[PDB]
Amino acid sequence: QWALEDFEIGRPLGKGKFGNVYLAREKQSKFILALKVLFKAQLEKAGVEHQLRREVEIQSHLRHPNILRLYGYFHDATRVYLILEYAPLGTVYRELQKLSKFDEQRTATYITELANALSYCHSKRVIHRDIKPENLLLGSAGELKIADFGWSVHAPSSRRTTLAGTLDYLPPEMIEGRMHDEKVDLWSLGVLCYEFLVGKPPFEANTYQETYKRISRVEFTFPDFVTEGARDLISRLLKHNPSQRPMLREVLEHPWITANSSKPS
Numbered sequence: 569q570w571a572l573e574d575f576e577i578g579r580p581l582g583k584g585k586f587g588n589v590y591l592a593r594e595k596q597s598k599f600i601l602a603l604k605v606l607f608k609a610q611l612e613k614a615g616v617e618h619q620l621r622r623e624v625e626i627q628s629h630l631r632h633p634n635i636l637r638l639y640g641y642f643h644d645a646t647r648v649y650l651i652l653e654y655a656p657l658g659t660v661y662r663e664l665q666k667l668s669k670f671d672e673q674r675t676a677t678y679i680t681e682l683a684n685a686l687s688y689c690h691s692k693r694v695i696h697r698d699i700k701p702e703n704l705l706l707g708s709a710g711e712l713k714i715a716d717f718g719w720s721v722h723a724p725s726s727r728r729t730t731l732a733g734t735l736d737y738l739p740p741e742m743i744e745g746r747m748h749d750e751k752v753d754l755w756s757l758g759v760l761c762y763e764f765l766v767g768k769p770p771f772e773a774n775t776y777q778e779t780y781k782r783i784s785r786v787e788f789t790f791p792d793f794v795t796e797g798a799r800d801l802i803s804r805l806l807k808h809n810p811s812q813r814p815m816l817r818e819v820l821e822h823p824w825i826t827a828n829s830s831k832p833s
């Protein structure tokens with residue numbers, strides 16, 4: 569139905585490994601959206617056609633306040649275009665660069681919004697597996713929305729797709745190429761909570777080889793300013809054994825979360 573001629577393209581919004589994303593306006597309605605442009609040659613070479621389909625499958629059917637909407641799609645023989653909800657306050661990645669560190673209220677509120685969205689997905693045994701700040705977007709009232717569901721699978725799962733950039737948000741069972749389930753997202757929530765308070769993730773290292781070792785051996789420490797309550801929650805999430813990490817319900821009722829979040833569970 570939609571074609572490229574139906575849109576006026578504008579401000580570049582961001583670049584991922586595959587997605588080139590631009591502000592755009594539909595001519596007849598004046599509707600503002602984010603147009604995510606993918607190159608067919610690149611998708612084919614990397615073998616990630618199935619990730620494009622998964623992203624369309626999940627995000628086109630949902631209507632959750634903390635998950636980014638996908639409205640539709642079209643294509644033209646060199647490119648595929650995804651028509652996305654525009655997030656006008658940008659990425660959490662950009663916001664952390666701006667502020668350097670988040671206070672406890674902002675942090676606990678974001679973790680609440682993340683746990684609300686992921687609780688919905690886990691109830692369907694869907695695991696995201698790629699929760700990192702560049703994939704977390706902000707709505708007009710500063711509310712967090714999870715995006716980029718291309719890596720998502722139903723649990724339990726193995727891995728057949730090659731890992732890309734950083735290891736920093738992935739748990740031991742994922743980097744070691746073992747069977748995995750919902751608890752992968754709980755580990756990543758712990759990594760985020762640390763990174764939001766401290767300004768860098770807990771296993772950050774200057775080589776890939778060293779990052780891998782730090783993750784596999786769960787080697788992290790806290791700076792002096794991180795409070796007892798935040799240490800308790802992060803320590804519960806960053807457990808080597810997935811079965812020992814809490815359920816999202818238990819995160820949402822943790823005393824430090826309920827004391828500091830400005831949003832309810």
Ligand SMILES: Nc1ncnc2c1ncn2[C@@H]1O[C@H](COP(=O)(O)OP(=O)(O)O)[C@@H](O)[C@H]1O
Binds near residue numbers: 718
């Ligand atoms: N709906 C959106 N609104 C505003 N910016 C966006 C939106 N979607 C993506 N971006 C920007 O584009 C970048 C890449 O988009 P993403 O969907 O993650 O592509 P990839 O699948 O290639 O990682 C994001 O990290 C963000 O900077």
Ligand SMILES: *SCCC(=O)Nc1cccc(Cl)c1F
Binds near residue numbers: 630690
């Ligand atoms: S992740 C939240 C829930 C969800 O994924 N629902 C859904 C919608 C459409 C298709 C499939 Cl497989 C789904 F799981």
Ligand SMILES: [Cl-]
Binds near residue numbers: 624
């Ligand atoms: Cl499809």
Ligand SMILES: [Cl-]
Binds near residue numbers: 789
């Ligand atoms: Cl350390």
Ligand SMILES: [Cl-]
Binds near residue numbers: 807808809812
């Ligand atoms: Cl353990």
Ligand SMILES: [Mg+2]
Binds near residue numbers: 584702
């Ligand atoms: Mg991305």
Ligand SMILES: [Mg+2]
Binds near residue numbers: 584586716718719
């Ligand atoms: Mg993607």
